[PDB]
Chains A and B, each alone.
Chain A
Amino acid sequence: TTIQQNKDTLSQIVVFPTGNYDKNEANAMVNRLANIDGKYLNALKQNNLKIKLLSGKLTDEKEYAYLKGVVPKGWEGTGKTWDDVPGLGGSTVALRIGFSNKGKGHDAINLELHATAHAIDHIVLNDISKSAQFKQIFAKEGRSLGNVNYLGVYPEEFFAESFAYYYLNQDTNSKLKSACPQTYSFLQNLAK
């Protein structure tokens, strides 16, 4: 099946932490990632992108220590810094196990799909969220998925969140089609 192929591709992308961690929840995260179109997963694998699952804070990892005390883009005024943030995506992907669900220190519909969408945007699609075409869609639809001072202000955030709605499950896919029809069509066409 296509889901099994996607799990095989993810086996060459996902990295588990050293030490004790919740293996069942790490498996559940992989299973949710396996719903992403295989073409994107294959491209991530070819670029040697790793999806790092973590059992502690992101900034406790040596490669993210430099973000200690840094206020993420869009998180101004929250009293929080990267120390508090459970997921990161872009040139790399790093994710705290257990923090997938919306509301666990973040507002994404799913942590791992949202972070991985940033990596797909940046690595696979050469920052398409900042293209004129997507900016035009974002101008119209970017306040229709909640969190207007974040998703509605940063097109790369609206891209990542939309991508997560499209791929998490049938209900979020349906909600995106209703709320953001142009974004939905854009994502459908990208995966063709």
Chain B
Amino acid sequence: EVNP
């Protein structure tokens, strides 16, 4: 899981 990745978020800017």
Contacts and interface: CB of A to CB of B under 8 A. Distances in A.
- Chain B contact-residue range equals under 10
B4 A87 contact: yes
A160 B2 contact: no
Q: Which 6 A/B pairs are nearest by Cβ-Cβ distance?
A: A90-B1, A72-B4, A91-B1, A118-B3, A90-B2, A85-B4
A160 B3 CA distance: 10
A91 B3 CA distance: 9
Interface of B: 1-4
A89 interface: yes
A139 B1 CA distance: 23
Interface residues of A, number: 20
B3 to A, nearest CB: 5
A153 to B, nearest CB: 13
A181 interface: no
A156 interface: yes
A75 B4 contact: yes
Contacts of B2: 67, 72, 88-92
Contacts of B3: 72-73, 88-90, 115, 118, 156-157, 160
Contacts of A160: 3
